[PDB]
Design a binder for these strands. Structure first.
Ligand SMILES: Nc1ncnc2c1ncn2[C@@H]1O[C@H](COP(=O)(O)OP(=O)(O)O)[C@@H](O)[C@H]1O
Ligand code: BEF
Ligand SMILES: [Zn+2]
Ligand SMILES: [Zn+2]
Lengths: 337, 343, 366, 369, 369
DNA sequence: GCAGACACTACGAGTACATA
DNA sequence: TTTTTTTATGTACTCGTAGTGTCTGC
């Protein structure tokens, strides 16, 4: 399945990062600020391959030593992974505590040690705090790797004890060329997907590979039906899913582009769908458009943040409040200081 | 399989004991009464030695099978009793019951006590093997409407005079708690052996030890009975039920009401109810609600519901119990202030 | 120890005859009629509010069942076993604090002691206190014993939380539920003990003690003992009022009373008193918001008042009837905004005071 | 109260402490019931241990200056103190206030006691039967009727053992609802007929205290109490209230078909056939013909044990199902060499008895073929 | 080619297989973790079991001609497939695709396997130090200081033993910050100075591995793990990264006050005093005077215990309070005739050692109330 | 011994409750 | 006439199992 799919835009950075470890002066803790699915996992995996290799050469693992074989097999006494438990999107303090207690003993293979957390943004406060000191002063030859959507989203204490590497996304033309090579579809839709993925080619490619593109097309059609009539409730049929935050973000981008079109911005995030954005711009006043956009993004943040929240109630209430906002003579929310 | 109610058991027991008796219901009182009657009749007909067992992954089944296959030195007639788990007979338990039915003998009388049987549970072959010759007793708690008739019938059986007021008080104070209702009937009969019970006599020795379910609260909201809904809500809070259960139970119905009110502008409720598998009593209650609720009231109800959900889930606050009274007073007939619905 | 006054009123004034228990007629009459008419159950389970008489009434039942002058509601108190039950220990009355013996390894021994014939009395009497804390396996053992109880044993279980017991135990026990004592009954009893203890008293102090008792007679007796302590052997109105003010915890309700009354000095004094007790300020604001929500629900319908707020029912009802809804909504908005702004204040005390000052500015007095 | 004193040797004290420890030490119903009651009277020491239904009292001779006082000292602590002292060292004991002082060679302890007024004691009871018996007879009666005793049955009367006094004969009866065991022996004296139920703890302590030496065990039975004297050990207990079932009915009073065999051969054959029985439905089937008997067992493997020509029989063909555990237990407890086994019917009780004596009898109920 | 010809006899592997299994696959942590590796080399079959921390290898001698290689199989399946075979069995294991076929007469069974490349295992490594230890020597070394390990303490470096080798001497040091135990034994072998910190679990598993003076033990210590070869069994446990404290600076520097007593007398006295000591604070206060040791204790119930011992004491009168458990443990470990105690100050630690042999030392740190 | 018996102590599991 | 519950971590409690100290007639 999904594995170390190396990406070209990681080449300038990887060769740099291994250098920081080749001289032996590298930081034990490297927090990667990379967009999801952009390639942070593959880069961290390759770095760990270099680190745990007993007889490495240049900028790649030998693939012959027993450390390389064990790493390939997925089992290694000196390669700990911290990933959310199956069916739960969080990293418990118990796993971090077990890993930290295991770090006390020496490395079995006589080499170094690697502790890789799949996503530091999913750390529970207790787990991140249990990892604080382990991050600060690890034992001899211990290496930590962290990945995050946003470093500032992490705990203000954990992020302090870590060298932060930022993976710059490729320029839009390079990304669209890469995805055109990977996917044979229209340029407009490809650019729209890249802008939707905040310029990250990996996320746009994953969006096209999955059914998310069909869902986006269905949501665009539902919006086209609902904008002139105000039948926003039907949007529920397209909005309620296990990937609801992504579709809410798509709606937010559409509202972004409607406000841009009213202001006349040269480029828009949704370039593949001009009819819907034009309909939104002409039908809805900017004053109510801003309120709808703010409420949609607030609902998205609430849905992402608090675990166990019910998607049905939140999405239905968002749609009903949007329909209420559409009616004239209704006060609008104002951002709170 | 003769399916009966506890009213008709006596005659059946006088007709002759059956190989197996399945006491199935959600009501402890009727189950216990049927079990006591069965055991009394069996003791009258020679069944002297009584054995009781609890079904459990910790049950020493081999002992049960040996007892069913071993004769006793005294009182060869034996009665076997089992207590079904809250989940009913599991697949392994179904096989165990099939093996027990295989060893069923004329001299052995079997009694089963537990919750209701779900369709899959009696689908298992052992149920039919028993049903070839057995009796099943449905001890289901009477609903709100059927309670006064049952209370009056038991009062006439117990030889005490109840008026309408005392019956209403007993129904209002003991709903879903028929065990406590019979305890109260015994208490009132023993307190005043005159046999005449009225409002002043019964208003003293009756407490509000009712047992409710979230469905009762939702149906009270649907029918528009605000006082009954508040009573159910307070009783459920005192019981300690999780408020998220109430939130989900109300949310399902409220979303259905919102969808049907949206669709009522094009299609009558008669077809709309048949579209989404709404039952007859539910059809009547839902039609009454949809006729007595507008769009604005439903929208405000959903707004208050999502505010309560956000308070419960991300703030871990303890104001959900007080806030649910907001929905209770908003749905029935009374619009509520804006600040209490959004903020 | 030294001097007879050491006897705690919660212990010395333990009822000894059915004529001494007060306010529990609906159970006393039932027990008397059952004992006299021969009607009897295998087990009797008592329940109700704390300090109402469940254990005392259970001990009275144990006295009545085991008097050689016949099974009767009223024991003589002269013979050997009647005194042995109260003074000293009686062999055939087995008193088990279930909280101390939750594990099944003790209930197993207890039910191994049920097959033995009673020594003195006819009925082997078991009194198990706080039966709602027994373990699940102990509950299974107790149910097994209760399924076929020998004719010479009758159980007595006393508890405060009946909801925790297995339904199969409730099914075989004729539960007696004891209602919380009324204010008048508590006051009359307190007057009775105070007059019969040669302790001076004043009626307003007795009314205050009864109101502060929250319905439990043990609370009233303890506050009476403290009132006698606070002073020189005299229950004075001033001493009782000062003690209750020291122990009072309804700062939020009196504070909203003063706020709606627009009495700024009263609100400030109440905030001072709450500060003296170290009251959590955010908890105070939360409780005030709850009170305002409840009073609004009362305004919408009088059914919003349940049995959970029976102590403050009259005050909330009268403050609902006299105050228009608009003032309630404005005060709720002001207090919610103030709680939102409370953490970002110089300190919690000044923040909550500033919120109250904001609320008082609406519809002020001359 | 105060002034009470001991001066006792460890050898003369250790064994009675072990005897009186019994069930004490665990969490008691009352805090006092963890303390041995120590008493002095007429120059002898009395140790008392109580369980609200038991009382074990040990008497120790005193030949040292002392004082007739009483106290209650924790059983575990006092026994540990008396055990940890050097061998042959004398313990000197006194009381002061609420502190009991123990002294040995350059060693002093203070222990917290409780007043003797609060110690429970078994109420005085008028005896109905007096009895004297050698230890060997009582041990034989108990050992041959303890295995077939009910275990935690919901029926109270089946718990414990039944004592029968009939003429010049003492009888012990045990029943678990499927098995019955009766062992009856002469005693050399005539007694009024009496039926008395003794609990499981009572028979356990009766069996434990029995000694291998010659001793006239002096039993004393009242309306609802039992007491036994073994030298200086006096053990009393309550009686299990109830109605033990009549043993004279279920036994094969008038049998017809019977078998004669050797106990060892039947034990070996039953053990061999035990492996031929599944754990569920764990039983055997005895198929008996003229001087023939095979033992099988229901099992998916479908095996058999076949030794027909090693038994005596004077009847017709029968096939009767037993439980292997019950027959194994009764054969092992019988311990004799020649065994008689009366087969009244295929659906009636079956008797197992000593073919060379009449001291014991056992009744086993077949289980549905 | 899929050769994998294993030709072994069952009874010669069941005990090794149970040994190497030990904590066999019961943890769902990793599918490969719950497996055992079969390897052929040096004319012998190596059975390897490892859970990424502890590795155990049994080197069983082969019977018939073999075919070298390695493959891993489910441990529980192999354990159960050879534990029920009647007496001996000619276990013939063959490779078919990804399968082991086990044959013995008319008994053919299958076990799905995994390649040995996936199984984590340790190859040859340069040992930092090598020991040829008699079994009795290491048994005494670990036994006399195993009670001094820290049981899951915050200081992670104290969670094990310090094996310090110096010259021709091997020392073990174990402490938890309250007690300390040092045991040094000669080896007659010039060995480089080294320090090892073996965890608690590793030393416990090593201790329950060696027995019988007939098979000398071979210890190989590297920079990251320790291996022990007892006969044909090999154990491997990782080391602790911490640094053990300098024990020679923990022992008192100037123990002016000397005491000598009998080991049995001290042990009996300490147990006797601990009978009435506090339940969770088992500490005695000890006074030394001229040829006299007074040990006293009490509990919250104020049941004081006091004893006096005739000792050979050199020094001034002194008071020191220390816990009883550590000193009873030290006295039990020192299976000697005379115990020598070193005391410096009423606030200083106490040294305990054998008076007749300078081979062990213990430090007890007193209680400051 | 001794091993069984018994005593005792520890670990896991299942359940219940509290908190944010 | 069948329908409804959020998490993460920790703290007790009560029971069977499980492994081991120890020691008494075996
Ligand atoms: N109904 C009552 N009548 C008289 N005294 C009472 C009553 N209820 C409580 N008390 C007083 O409180 C003391 C303790 O009462 P108790 O019955 O033990 O309360 P609980 O219900 O909490 O077990 C009694 O000694 C008595 O003084
Ligand atoms: F105060 Be009671 F005995 F629960
Ligand atoms: Zn490599
Ligand atoms: Zn009397």
């Amino acid at each position: 399945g999904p594995h170390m799919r190396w990406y070209p835009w990681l080449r300038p950075d990887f060769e740099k990062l291994v250098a920081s470890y080749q001289a032996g002066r590298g930081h034990h803790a490297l927090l990667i600020q990379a967009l999801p699915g952009m390639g942070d996992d593959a880069l961290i995996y390759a770095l760990s391959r270099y680190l745990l290799c007993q007889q490495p050469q240049g900028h790649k693992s030998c693939g012959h030593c027993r450390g390389c074989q064990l790493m390939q097999a997925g089992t290694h006494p000196d390669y700990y992974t911290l990933a959310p438990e199956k069916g739960k999107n969080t990293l418990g303090v118990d796993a971090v505590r077990e890993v930290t207690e295991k770090l006390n003993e020496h490395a079995r293979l006589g080499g170094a040690k690697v502790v890789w957390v799949t996503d530091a943004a999913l750390l529970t406060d207790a787990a991140a705090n249990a990892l604080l000191k382990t991050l600060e002063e690890p034992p001899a030859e211990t290496w930590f790797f962290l990945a995050t959507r946003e470093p500032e989203r992490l705990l203000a204490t954990l992020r302090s004890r870590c060298r932060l590497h930022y993976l710059a996304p490729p320029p839009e033309q390079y990304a669209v060329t890469w995805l055109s090579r990977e996917v044979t579809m229209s340029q407009d839709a490809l650019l729209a997907a890249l802008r939707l993925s905040a310029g990250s080619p990996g996320a746009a490619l994953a969006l096209f590979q999955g059914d998310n593109w069909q869902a986006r097309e269905t949501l665009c059609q539902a919006l086209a039906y609902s904008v002139p009539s105000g039948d926003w409730y039907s949007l529920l049929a397209a909005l309620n899913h296990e990937q609801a935050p992504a579709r809410l973000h798509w709606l937010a981008t559409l509202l972004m582009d409607a406000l841009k079109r009213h202001h006349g911005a040269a480029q828009v995030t949704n370039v593949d769908v001009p009819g819907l954005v034009a309909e939104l711009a002409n039908h809805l006043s900017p004053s109510r458009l801003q309120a709808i956009l703010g409420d949609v993004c607030h609902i998205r943040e609430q849905l992402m943040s608090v675990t166990g929240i019910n998607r049905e109630l939140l999405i239905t209430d968002l749609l009903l409040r949007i329909e209420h906002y559409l009616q004239p003579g209704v006060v609008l929310p104002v951002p709170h200081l | 399989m003769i399916r009966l109610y506890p009213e008709q058991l006596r005659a059946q027991l006088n007709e002759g004991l059956r190989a197996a008796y399945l006491l199935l219901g959600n009501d402890p009182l009727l189950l216990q009464e049927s079990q006591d009657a069965v055991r009394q009749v069996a003791a009258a007909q020679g069944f002297e030695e009584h054995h009781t067992f609890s079904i459990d992954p910790n049950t020493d089944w081999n002992a049960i099978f040996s007892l069913c296959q071993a004769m006793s030195l005294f009182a060869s007639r034996q009665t076997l009793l089992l207590l079904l788990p809250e989940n009913g007979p599991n697949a392994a338990i179904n096989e165990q019951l099939l093996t027990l039915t295989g060893l069923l003998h004329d001299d052995l009388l079997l009694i089963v006590r537990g919750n209701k049987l779900s369709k899959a549970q009696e689908n298992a072959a052992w149920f039919t093997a028993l049903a070839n010759r057995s009796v099943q007793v449905t001890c289901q708690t009477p609903e709100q409407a059927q309670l006064p008739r049952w209370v009056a019938a038991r009062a006439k059986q117990l030889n005490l005079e109840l008026d309408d007021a005392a019956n209403q008080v007993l129904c209002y104070c003991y709903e879903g708690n028929l065990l406590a209702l019979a305890q109260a009937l015994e208490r009132l009969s023993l307190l005043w052996p005159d046999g005449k019970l009225t409002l002043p006599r019964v208003e003293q020795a009756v407490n509000d030890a009712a047992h409710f379910t979230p469905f009762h609260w939702v149906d009270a909201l649907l029918m528009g009975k605000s006082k009954r809904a508040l009573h159910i809500l307070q009783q459920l809070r005192l019981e300690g039920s999780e408020p998220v259960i109430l939130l989900r139970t109300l949310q399902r119905e409220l979303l259905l009401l919102v969808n049907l009110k949206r669709q009522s502008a094009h299609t009558p409720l008669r077809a709309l109810f048949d579209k989404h598998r709404v039952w007859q009593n539910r059809r009547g209650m839902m039609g009454e609600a949809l006729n007595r609720l507008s769009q604005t009231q439903l929208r405000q109800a959903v707004q208050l519901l999502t505010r309560t959900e956000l308070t419960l889930k991300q703030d871990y606050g303890q104001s959900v119990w007080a806030e649910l009274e907001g929905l209770s007073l908003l749905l029935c007939h009374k619009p509520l202030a804006d600040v209490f619905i959004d903020g | 120890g030294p001097h007879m006054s050491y006897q705690v009123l919660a212990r010395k004034w333990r009822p000894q005859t059915f004529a001494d228990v007060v306010g529990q007629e609906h159970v006393l009459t039932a027990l008397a009629n059952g004992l006299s008419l021969g009607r009897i159950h295998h087990a009797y389970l008592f329940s109700g509010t704390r300090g109402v008489g469940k254990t005392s009434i259970a001990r009275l039942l144990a006295k009545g069942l085991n008097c050689e002058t016949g099974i009767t509601a009223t024991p003589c108190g002269v013979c050997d076993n009647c005194r042995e039950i109260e003074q000293g220990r009686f062999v055939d009355l087995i008193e088990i604090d279930a909280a101390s013996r939750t594990k099944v390894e003790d209930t197993r021994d207890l039910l191994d002691n049920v097959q033995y014939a009673p020594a003195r009395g006819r009925f082997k009497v078991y009194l198990i206190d706080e039966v709602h804390m027994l373990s699940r396996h102990s509950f299974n053992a107790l149910l097994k014993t209760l399924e076929e109880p020998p004719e010479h044993v009758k159980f007595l279980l006393a508890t405060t939380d009946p909801q925790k017991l297995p339904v199969t135990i409730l099914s075989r026990c004729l539960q007696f539920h004891l209602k919380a004592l009324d204010v008048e009954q508590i006051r009359h009893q307190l007057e009775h003990i105070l007059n019969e203890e040669h302790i001076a008293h004043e009626p307003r102090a007795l009314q205050l003690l009864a109101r502060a008792a929250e319905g439990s007679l043990r609370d009233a007796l303890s506050l009476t003992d403290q009132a006698i302590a606070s002073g020189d052997g005299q229950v004075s109105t001033q001493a009782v009022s000062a003690m209750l003010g020291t122990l009072d915890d309804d700062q939020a309700l009196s504070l909203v009373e003063a706020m709606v009354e627009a009495n700024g000095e009263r609100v400030m004094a109440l905030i001072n008193e709450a500060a003296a007790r170290g009251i959590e300020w955010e908890a105070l604001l939360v409780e005030m918001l709850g009170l305002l929500h409840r009073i609004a629900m009362v305004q919408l319908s009088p059914a919003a008042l349940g049995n959970d707020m029976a102590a403050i029912e009259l005050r909330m009802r009268e403050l609902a009837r006299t105050i228009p809804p608009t003032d309630i909504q404005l005060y709720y908005q002001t207090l919610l905004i103030g709680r939102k702004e409370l953490p970002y204040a110089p300190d919690r005390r000044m923040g909550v005071e500033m919120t109250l000052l904001r609320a008082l500015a609406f519809h002020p007095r001359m | 109260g105060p002034h009470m004193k001991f001066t006792v040797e460890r050898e003369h004290l250790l064994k009675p402490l072990q005897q009186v420890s019994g069930p004490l030490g665990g969490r008691p119903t009352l805090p006092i019931l963890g303390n041995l009651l120590l008493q002095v009277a007429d120059g002898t020491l009395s140790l008392t241990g109580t369980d609200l239904e038991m009382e074990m009292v040990a008497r120790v001779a005193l030949v040292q200056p002392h004082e007739p006082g009483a106290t209650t000292v924790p059983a575990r602590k006092f026994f540990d103190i008396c055990r940890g002292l050097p061998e042959g060292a004398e313990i000197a004991v006194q009381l002061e206030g609420e502190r009991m002082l123990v002294r040995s060679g350059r060693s002093r302890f203070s222990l917290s006691t409780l007043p003797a007024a609060d110690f429970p004691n078994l109420d005085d009871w008028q005896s109905e039967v007096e009895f004297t018996l050698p230890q060997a007879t009582m041990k034989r009666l108990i050992e041959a009727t303890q295995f077939s005793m009910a275990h935690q049955d919901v029926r109270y009367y089946l718990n414990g053992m039944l004592f029968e006094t009939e003429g010049e004969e003492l009888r012990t009866v045990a029943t678990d609802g499927h098995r019955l065991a009766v062992c009856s022996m002469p005693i050399g004296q005539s007694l009024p007929s009496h039926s008395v139920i003794v609990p499981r703890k009572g028979v356990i302590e009766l069996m434990r205290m029995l000694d291998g030496g010659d001793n006239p065990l002096r039993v004393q039975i009242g309306s609802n109490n039992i007491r036994a004297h073994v030298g200086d050990f006096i053990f009393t207990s309550k009686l299990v209230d109830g109605r033990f079932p009549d043993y004279r009915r279920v036994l094969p009073k008038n049998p017809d078909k019977h078998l004669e065999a050797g106990c060892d051969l039947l034990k070996q054959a039953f053990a061999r056939a035990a492996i031929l029985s599944n754990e569920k439905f764990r039983g055997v089937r005895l198929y008996v013909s003229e001087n023939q008997l095979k033992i099988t067992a229901n099992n998916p493997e479908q095996e058999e044990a076949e030794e027909i020509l090693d038994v005596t029989y004077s009847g017709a063909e029968m096939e009767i199902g037993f439980n292997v555990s019950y027959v194994l237990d009764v054969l092992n407890a019988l311990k004799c060499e020649n065994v008689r086994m009366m087969l009244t019917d295929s659906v009636s009780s079956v008797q197992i008895e000593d073919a060379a004596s009449q001291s014991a009898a056992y009744v086993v109920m077949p289980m549905r073929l």
